[PDB]
Amino acid sequence: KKIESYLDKLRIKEKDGEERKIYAEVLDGRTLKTLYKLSAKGYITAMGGVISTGKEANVFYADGVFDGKPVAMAVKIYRIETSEFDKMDEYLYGDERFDMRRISPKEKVFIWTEKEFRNLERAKEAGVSVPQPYTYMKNVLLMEFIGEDELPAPTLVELGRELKELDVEGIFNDVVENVKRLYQEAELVHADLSEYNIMYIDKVYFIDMGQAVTLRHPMAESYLERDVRNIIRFFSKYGVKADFEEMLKEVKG
Template sequence: MKRDVERIERLLDRLRIKEKDSEARKIYAEVFDERTLKTLYKLSAKGLIQALGGVVSTGKEANVFYADGRIDGDDRPLAVKIYRIETTEFFKMDEYLFGDKRFDMRRISRKELIFIWVEKEFRNLERAHNAGVNVPEPYEYLKNVLLMEFLGEDERPYPTLFELKRELPEVVNVEDLYAKVKENLIRLYRKAELVHADLSEYNIVLKNDEPYFIDMGQSVLADHPLASEYLERDVRNLLRFFSKYGVKERPEEVVTEIKG
């Protein structure tokens, strides 16, 4: 046990952790195992992570941390999404992986599943970003760690629609916002040929009155066997939320519009 702690401490010493977020050191040591810390060190050694900061969000499968980064020679704020290697929740994700022609799941062990999931999220974000969809720009991935654009200011993330639900009409024109969300859905489906598959007010961030889709690990190609089912679910989730602000549309008509 003592040797394990010493190894973790040595890895933490090699990572750049911002002094004002000294509590982050304790969080990294408690939450992430030695393999994850080694992966973070490799990304830091490549110069991509300049300094690790505090927690942006936490979840069952992953935590997101802030970091000062350097991408293509430019200083940029990063969101560092770290999936837990030992998680019991990934059995729920099988349906989003199997049926995706980009991955041969016959050759993937359960141990490697988390790494495939991270690669999938990176590729989904890259595909969406290249199609002009409002998503965080992906920068790099390695094993269970994904580096991407940080959506926020002064190390604080922009709010989700869920977090803004009470004051949303005071912050933005809701009908215009809904139209922008739908336009991004159309672009996602027609140009990126993707379905988000878990879209709701929890996974849409508001940046300067513009909606951004996040958490795209489960997103599937438009030719996935369950793509139509997922798209309809996404639309129903959105209409459930926006109907509270007077938006009235029929789910089947919206789905038809998105598909063109």
């Protein structure tokens, strides 16, 4: 009788029956190896529970270490099996950072992971409120946990009416300053900015930077105006009133 996998080499907190099963269901062998390697290099101390499960990617909690300090991490793992001309194949158009002449359909998830990492770096350097990026390897990206005591921060859509108890008007303005910094100093535009990928603890955080295109992308402008519409739409529901062309101007400067 041969062990099925090397999963028990990972350090997983509260690894009862069901916890193990979850990991054993979502990790493939190649991903397992990558997590093991990150643990041995010192980045991952122990892995915790599932934070998000999704089509393109799953996210888990981990305690780990960056730059000599203890940190709480979000461990984002892209599913390696990918299709069919992803939306994220298209999100590379016009991106000088990445040379198609070098890249093959098989490794395309590695590039998306890479691109998310570098977008977090870029956005952080521009003063955008995003998770601090730590490292990446293969289809695994390690970044700052936005939350407290292993509870992720609510998204704006989770908060809803509650936003009315936190200055919904300052929150909208916080969202708007972040899109402005992203556009003007990072030179990025989120492909689909919404109440689903914005978190809030005591300020806004933009938390899925993989869906962000450079300004040379053919649809940059369109995506920007759509983002502005999404944001006014959602906030208008809570009694913030704002003008499209005046926010678009604020962002575009």
